[PDB]
Write a protein that binds this ligand. Structure first.
Ligand SMILES: Nc1ccc2cc[nH]c2c1
Length: 1111
């Protein structure tokens, strides 16, 4: 009944957890990072973090722990998902193939069970005797770690203590032993139990329980030789080992709750601690010797190290390097110095990693050009709060521009053998060559002795033995560097024209029609080594040397006319090693051997925009794993360039593209330029690390931005952004923000709201939140003005709009007055502001008797939700708001969207409702509601008949009218899908320049994931659903979780299969399965090019390409 497609535009960026150990090999130090559904694996080096493997799970990662059973040569990985999928994983590398194998799996949910309010805890015994899970209050689940237990069968033990705060397994125990903090009416306590596998029960623990601090929140199990447990609370740190109790109450920790810990030293001598304000502490355990050779704890000390990003997790990586995993701001690598700096800090930031999360609001604006949307998010919280401006594609910064038509090729040269930098740019034209010298930023034409100017150049460059080479249609010319003189010239025996050229430092391959010649470059000599006749005319050549080759290629890659083949030939024999037939009647135009992330590839571009690529074995010449992308409709020209110490490929066409690697897969990202015909890298004194680019009329020189799909600009606020709206007439954004002050009240740090150019305050007719409306310039993102709201006033909703017959555009803010003893607010305001002359004027205020959760402009009127009431206001001639009509049938109307006369209302707990304004009655009619209870987080109108909802348990659903009168009032849930993210905001728009799909709704999430929802026809839905079912049979899932299980709608109240939703991530993955798998997937499908007939792999590759470009 409803057909929707949902796909990831930006994967989650928030770090939910991190572990270190020896997973990829016994000798590697790994860092593993969980970003919701994604597991990232790195090797730690002196250099830094090397990415080795990234996988997606069909689940939200809730537990992630490395452990090493007896008999295992490296660590295994335990994962538990939020849906209670358990697995044990092993990393296997076989040559260049990397696989995550599932050693054991099973689902560990109970039948009865309310999920613990305080979350899943999973722990592993240091001796690998068992895994312990705290999933539900009153129960401790044990998975025995027998090699026979491949289904991860478990048993429950009754836990008398219902409210466990934290739990760990202790070190140095003859029986597996837990230590936990729990809360009862008498306060908080620490207790132990032994876990008996033979009795399937707890036994008495090795040390008696103790009372601990009221806010004790974390247990640390200390390794030998200490043993025992550290308990961290808000104002104290204790150590327990039974006949041993030590407690400190250091004032330095009292200001902010400590929420993460990490062991620095293997023997437990030192720990890192992080708090909610980003402070980083060292906790030091002092040893005392004993006559019997045991070691006991003499004392505990805490030292402030410095400040990081607000940390969800901390992992020491050796050599003073710490990974700071953040969910509220950017993650970091930081260095800990033995010695402090001038401010007193031991912490120096080394690297920053983007985190968009939480995305609490966003909007789409065409900031720069028409039809080019950019997303502007409210991101992060507290000192990490920011705006982020997100846009597709890679930018070029143009530093020179020369009118110079008809360029047919570009080559950089070093004319001076004792200078590292290029100083020369050689240009081809039809039948001609020109040489440009670069003196600083000046670009002067010149002659270069030895080169000819009256033939078209096909290649020129630096070659061996301090020589230059020029290959024209007439000849190969070898030139000495000092002086510049012709030292050798090669021509074909009858002086026929050269038609194609390739060259490296010491080797040349030229074609003459069907003939190939192989030359070597020697001192003052072009030596003809070998020649052959090809079966067909030669279209293109490459001899780029790959690997540890000492600059010599044993391979020649060639593309031919007629059979449209890409072939790998041996040099010098020209023996055929491998032939691939690319199909069609359009010849190959560019062919390249290249390396990305240490793997070798063959790229071959056809004249119609198709790019084929293959893995290349540089020993045997074998091509494998053919893939195909479309990069335009014109011939593509491929050229290697380096930026930021990585070789990538620039693809010149009508759609210029950079080809690069991510996670050992090739990626293709648009370059934000009009058509580029030719390019070369250029690294000159005046133009360092640059690119020369030519079109039909112009030569450009510029630098390229970071090679990535999305560009992100960060605007730090140093306080929490809450809501955003764009006001085109003022060329600014309005942003609601909140800062923490301590109780009047004192600010903790300067921030956007305290650092505006000018400021205003409402006049009254982690201690406290102070709320502000910020006015932010759309170009500079400077804070132009800040308006501070009343004490205890929280700003909840924001719109920019015109109303009534008034020509002005206003910022309008809805608020709540927040008092401690109120279950909800009973007072709030709507405030209408005008931004003029650098300041906000208050135009009008309206007191209302509740919180103004949501506002929307509605046909020149203001629609607002106020507690349980939806209200429509008119803007009168006297510039005040006046109630037109009200709707009362809500619990708490949190979310509003409108389309025409229709309003979609999202409720705290009663799902969604559809209102209509009735223009000839001047009131609302309730059209229909969804009678299924759902705890809503966001809503959107997809179209007049389809309503999208997101809810608190990470599901999407779609409601429609059911097409009685009591019947007409029941919305039907026709689409259901477990997304696995928490949606804060939906907004119509696209990041793609303005099909299988209709409409575009972007969404932003707590983890910083951005997604897209679009609509499908029944026909497309049916085809893609069939594809999913076929993909799910062939793809091996990590942990052997079923895709259908993962995507099943799931709340405490119900579990149902997904319906009416295509998983775009799964569909897009079709492009990465093997060709036999593609055949498996395609068999006996129906596809419409025409009439419904059998689909081919190539059909579906094209389809999934159409789908990828919607984001
Ligand atoms: N004891 C033991 C050893 C290896 C594995 C692999 C999965 N579960 C295990 C338990």
């Amino acid at each position: 009944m409803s057909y929707n497609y949902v796909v990831t535009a930006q994967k989650p960026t928030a770090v939910n957890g991190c572990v270190t150990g020896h997973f990829t090999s016994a000798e590697d130090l790994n860092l593993l990072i969980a970003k919701n559904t994604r597991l990232e694996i790195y090797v730690v080096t002196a250099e830094g973090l090397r990415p080795v493997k990234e996988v997606g799970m069909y689940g939200k990662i809730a537990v992630m722990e490395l452990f090493r059973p007896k008999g295992e040569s490296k660590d295994l990985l335990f994962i538990l998902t939020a849906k209670y999928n358990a697995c044990i994983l092993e990393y296997k590398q076989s040559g260049e193939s990397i696989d995550i194998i599932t050693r054991a799996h099973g689902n560990v949910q109970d039948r009865i069970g309310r999920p613990s309010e305080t979350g899943i805890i999973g722990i592993i015994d240091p001796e690998c005797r068992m895994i312990g899970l705290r999933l539900y209050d009153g129960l401790f689940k044990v998975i025995p770690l027998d090699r026979d237990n491949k289904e991860l069968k478990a048993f429950n033990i009754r836990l008398e203590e219902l409210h466990v705060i934290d739990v760990k397994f202790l070190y140095g125990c003859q029986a597996p032993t837990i230590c936990f903090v729990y809360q009862d009416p008498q306060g908080r306590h620490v207790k132990t139990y032994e876990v008996s596998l033979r009795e399937k029960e707890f036994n008495k623990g090795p040390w008696k329980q103790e009372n601990v601090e009221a806010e004790a929140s974390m247990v640390i199990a200390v390794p030998e030789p200490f043993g025992g447990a550290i308990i961290i609370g808000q104002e104290s740190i204790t150590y327990h080992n039974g006949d041993k109790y030590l407690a400190i109450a250091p004032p330095i920790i009292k200001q902010s709750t400590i929420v993460c810990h990490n062991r620095v030293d293997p023997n437990g001598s030192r720990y890192l601690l992080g708090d909610m304000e980003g402070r980083l502490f060292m906790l030091l355990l002092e040893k005392e010797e004993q006559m019997d050779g045991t070691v006991t704890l003499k004392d505990l000390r805490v030292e402030l190290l410095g400040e990081t990003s607000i940390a969800e997790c901390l992992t020491y990586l050796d050599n003073g390097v710490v990974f700071v995993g953040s969910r509220l701001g950017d993650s970091q690598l930081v260095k800990l110095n033995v010695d402090s700096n001038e401010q007193g800090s031991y912490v120096v930031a080394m690297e920053t990693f983007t985190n968009l999360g939480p995305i609490v609001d966003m909007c789409v604006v065409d900031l720069e050009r028409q039809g080019q949307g950019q997303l502007v998010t409210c991101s992060g919280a507290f000192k990490e709060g920011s705006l982020r401006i997100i846009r597709n594609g890679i930018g070029i910064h143009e530093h020179a521009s020369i009118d110079l038509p008809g360029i047919k090729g570009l080559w950089p040269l070093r004319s001076d053998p004792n200078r590292e930098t290029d100083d020369t740019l050689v240009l081809s034209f039809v039948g001609q060559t020109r040489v440009l010298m670069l003196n600083g930023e000046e670009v002067e034409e010149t002659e270069l002795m030895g080169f000819v100017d009256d033939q078209q150049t096909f290649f020129c460059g630096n070659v061996a033995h301090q020589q230059l080479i020029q290959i024209t249609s007439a000849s190969v010319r070898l030139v000495s560097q000092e002086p510049k003189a012709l030292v050798s010239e090669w021509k074909e025996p009858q002086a026929k024209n050269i038609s194609v050229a390739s060259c490296n430092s010491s080797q040349v391959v030229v074609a003459v029609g069907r003939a190939l010649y192989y030359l070597q470059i020697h001192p003052q000599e072009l030596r003809q080594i070998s020649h052959t006749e090809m079966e067909h005319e030669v279209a293109c050549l490459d001899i780029t040397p790959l690997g540890d080759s000492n600059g010599l290629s044993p391979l020649c890659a060639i593309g031919l006319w007629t059979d449209i083949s890409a072939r790998i030939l041996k040099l010098p024999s020209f023996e055929l090693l491998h032939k691939e037939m690319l199909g069609g009647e359009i010849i190959p135009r560019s062919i390249l051997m290249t390396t990305f992330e240490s793997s070798h590839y063959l790229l071959c571009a056809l004249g119609d925009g198709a790019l084929f690529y293959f893995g290349l074995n540089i020993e045997t010449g074998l091509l494998s794993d053919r893939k195909k992308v479309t990069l335009g409709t014109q011939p593509t020209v491929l050229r290697t360039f380096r930026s930021l110490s990585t070789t990538n490929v620039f693809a010149c066409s009508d759609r210029p593209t950079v080809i690069y690697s991510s996670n050992h897969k090739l990626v293709f990202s648009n370059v934000n330029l009009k058509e580029v015909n030719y390019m070369c890298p250029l690294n000159s004194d005046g133009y360092p690390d640059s690119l020369a680019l030519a079109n039909n009329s112009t030569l450009t020189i510029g630098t390229i931005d970071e090679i990535q799909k999305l560009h992100i600009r960060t605007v730090p606020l140093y306080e929490s952004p809450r809501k955003i709206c764009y006001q085109e007439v003022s060329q600014c954004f309005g942003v609601l923000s909140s800062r923490i002050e301590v109780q009047g009240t004192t600010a903790l740090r300067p921030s956007a709201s305290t650092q505006a150019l000018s400021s205003s305050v409402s006049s009254s007719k982690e201690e406290v939140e102070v709320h502000n409306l910020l006015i932010i310039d759309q170009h500079t993102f400077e804070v132009l003005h800040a308006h501070q709201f009343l004490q205890n006033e929280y700003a909840l909703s924001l719109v920019s709009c015109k109303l009534g017959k008034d020509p002005n555009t206003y910022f309008i803010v809805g608020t709540a007055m927040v008092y401690p003893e109120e279950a909800e607010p009973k007072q709030g305001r709507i405030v209408v502001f005008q931004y003029s002359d650098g300041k906000l004027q208050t135009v009008a205020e309206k007191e209302v008797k509740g919180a103004v959760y949501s506002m929307v402009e509605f046909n020149g009127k203001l629609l607002a939700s106020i507690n349980s009431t939806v209200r429509l206001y008119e803007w009168t001639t006297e510039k005040e708001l006046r109630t037109e009509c009200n709707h009362y049938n809500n619990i708490m109307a949190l979310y509003l969207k409108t389309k025409g006369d229709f309003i979609l209302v999202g409720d705290l707990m009663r799902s969604v409702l559809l209102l209509a304004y009735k223009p000839m009655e001047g009131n609302f009619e309730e059209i229909a509601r969804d009678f299924n209870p759902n705890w809503m987080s966001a809503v959107e109108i997809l179209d007049d008949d389809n309503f999208l909802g997101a809810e608190n348990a990470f599901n999407l659903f779609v409601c429609q009218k059911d097409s009685t009168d009591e019947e007409r009032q029941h919305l039907q849930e026709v689409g259901l899908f477990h997304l696995g993210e928490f949606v804060n905001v939906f907004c119509h728009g696209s990041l793609v320049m303005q099909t299988p799909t209709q409409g575009s709704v972007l969404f932003g999430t707590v983890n910083g994931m951005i997604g897209l929802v679009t609509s499908l026809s029944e026909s497309w839905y049916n085809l893609l659903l069939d594809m999913q079912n076929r993909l799910n049979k062939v793809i091996k899932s990590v942990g052997k979780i079923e895709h259908s299980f993962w995507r099943s709608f799931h709340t405490e109240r119900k579990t149902e299969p997904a319906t009416g939703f295509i998983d775009g991530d799964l569909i897009e993955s079709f492009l990465d399965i093997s060709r036999p798998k593609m055949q498996e997937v395609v068999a006996n499908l129906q596809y419409d090019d025409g009439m419904k007939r059998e689909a081919t792999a190539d059909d579906l590759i094209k389809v999934v390409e159409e789908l990828t470009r919607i984001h």
